[PDB]
Symmetry: C4
Subunit: 93 residues, 4 copies
């Protein structure tokens, strides 16, 4: 429950940090832009600009396959154990 959500949160944070480091150093992007790219790639939203370095593409494939499940599980647990109870409470008379 609580510990599960917190573990998922920390795991997603570390994964996003790794992706940001990668895309800011290897690819050469700015830190916030690298974070945006990581989020949009792990959330399947997408971006206009794409990687160019072959190492970047390899890491992108592995990163998707490694972190999509984690990010989407974190979203599911955030909606089921954080957003839903909050809405239920703020909808009580």
């Amino acid at each position: 429950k609580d510990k599960e959500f917190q573990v998922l949160f920390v795991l997603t944070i570390l994964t996003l940090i790794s992706g940001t480091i990668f895309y800011s150093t290897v690819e050469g992007l700015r830190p916030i832009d690298a974070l945006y790219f990581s989020v949009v790639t792990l959330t399947t939203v997408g971006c206009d600009i794409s990687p160019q370095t072959d190492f970047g593409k390899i890491f992108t494939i592995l990163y998707i396959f490694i972190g999509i499940g984690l990010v989407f599980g974190f979203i599911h647990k955030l909606a089921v154990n954080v957003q839903l109870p909050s809405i239920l409470s703020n909808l009580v008379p």
Copy 2:
């Protein structure tokens, strides 16, 4: 059931309104284009043009993580409690 679908609908509407206000004022887009961006970002479809303001990127990350679960739950409930019964009725002899 009905109240659940309506609550999800109103929540999605308010979230989309917030996103539209943000992207139309801060980013500087037109209202309908801001609504399209919000929908495509919360639905994971995507867009060709991306945010440019750092504040915009921060809000985009938080907006995705806050509204993807809501939008997709609304889609699920719309398909299970609105689309499915309608199809079943219009498929009855």
Copy 3:
């Protein structure tokens, strides 16, 4: 089962046909390109080119919200009742 998959298939086909007609007439795209746009939008994959007509954007929002659930349910049923049994049979000794 079978009838469910077939109904989902026909519904997805009609939805894609409607989207193709729209994007080929109003937007002004070629039929196959309109079909590709409809598929990539209902499947959340994405595209490089985006709508430009305000009517196009309205229809895109409504089309996403109306057909994402249908397309993804069709994919789920195709994987559970068509792909999975086929793989099980072709994996039998």
Copy 4:
């Protein structure tokens, strides 16, 4: 369990190989770029560049509809039977 995950892995690998061959020969892309395109299309992440050949678009539609279910099932099973036990073990005192 184990055999299920391995079968899904091999199926995804073969599907990605087919997509890479297609996009590297017909479309004319480089092998790693074709693999990236296949991954981003089957994972619904997206890409900046889109197909141009009509045959390419037909194959893209069929490829999405044929492999999205497989790729996402592989991701689900990888998260439930590989990532989750590993995290549980590395979180044990």
